[PDB]
């Protein structure tokens, strides 16, 4: 188990992530 | 929980990524 | 240990920068 | 604490973006 400031830092890492692809794509 | 560094880290992310967003907007 | 998710969200970020940097070199 | 792999992950991150910030400076 992670902090849950970190759990939820990383799924809006990952969100990030997703739109920027999308953004790209 | 997470590592102590581990906290600094994201917090230093999601920073980045709020003044990214600003300085876009 | 960490949560799973933060697990794979650090693989991810982490592959991202590796292929980020073979693009650029 | 963290998985081993997480506070890797983290450091490296961290040193992508102190590397990034004295590139731009
Ligand atoms: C391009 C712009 C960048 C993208 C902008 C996206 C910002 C998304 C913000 C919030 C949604 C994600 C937060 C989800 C948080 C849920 C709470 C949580 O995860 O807590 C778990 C805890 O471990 C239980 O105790
Ligand atoms: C248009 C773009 C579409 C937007 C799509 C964005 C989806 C965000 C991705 C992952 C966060 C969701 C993962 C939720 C699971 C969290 C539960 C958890 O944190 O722990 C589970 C672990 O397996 C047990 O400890
Ligand atoms: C655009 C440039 C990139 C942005 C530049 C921003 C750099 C911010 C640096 C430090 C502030 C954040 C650090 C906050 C650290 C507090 C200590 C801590 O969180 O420790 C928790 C621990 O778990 C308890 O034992
Ligand atoms: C001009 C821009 C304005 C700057 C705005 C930047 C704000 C940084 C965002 C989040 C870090 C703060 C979150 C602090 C909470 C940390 C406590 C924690 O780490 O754990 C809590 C958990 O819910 C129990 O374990
Ligand atoms: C340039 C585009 C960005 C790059 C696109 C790459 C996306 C990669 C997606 C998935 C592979 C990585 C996921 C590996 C996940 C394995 C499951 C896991 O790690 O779970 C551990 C857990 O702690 C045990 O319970
Ligand atoms: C063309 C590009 C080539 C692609 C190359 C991408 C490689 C991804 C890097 C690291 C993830 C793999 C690390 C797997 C180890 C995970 C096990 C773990 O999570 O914990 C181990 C810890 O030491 C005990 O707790
Ligand atoms: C611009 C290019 C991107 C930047 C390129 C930089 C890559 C740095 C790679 C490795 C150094 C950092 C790794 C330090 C890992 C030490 C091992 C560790 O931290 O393990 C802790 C564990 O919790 C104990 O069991
Ligand atoms: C030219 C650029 C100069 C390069 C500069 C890059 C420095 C990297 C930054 C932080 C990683 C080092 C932090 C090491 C501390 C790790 C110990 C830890 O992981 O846990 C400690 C915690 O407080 C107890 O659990
Ligand atoms: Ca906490
Ligand atoms: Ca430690
Ligand atoms: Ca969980
Ligand atoms: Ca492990
Ligand atoms: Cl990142
Ligand atoms: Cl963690
Ligand atoms: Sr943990």
């Given amino acids: 188990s ?3 400031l970190v759990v ?3 799924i809006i ?3 990030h992530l997703i739109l920027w ?3 790209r794509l």
Wanted: aromatic fraction near 0%.
């Fill in 13 to 15: 890492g990952i969100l």
């Fill in 2 to 4: 992670s902090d849950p």
């Fill in 21 to 23: 692809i999308l953004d």
């Fill in 8 to 10: 939820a830092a990383n």
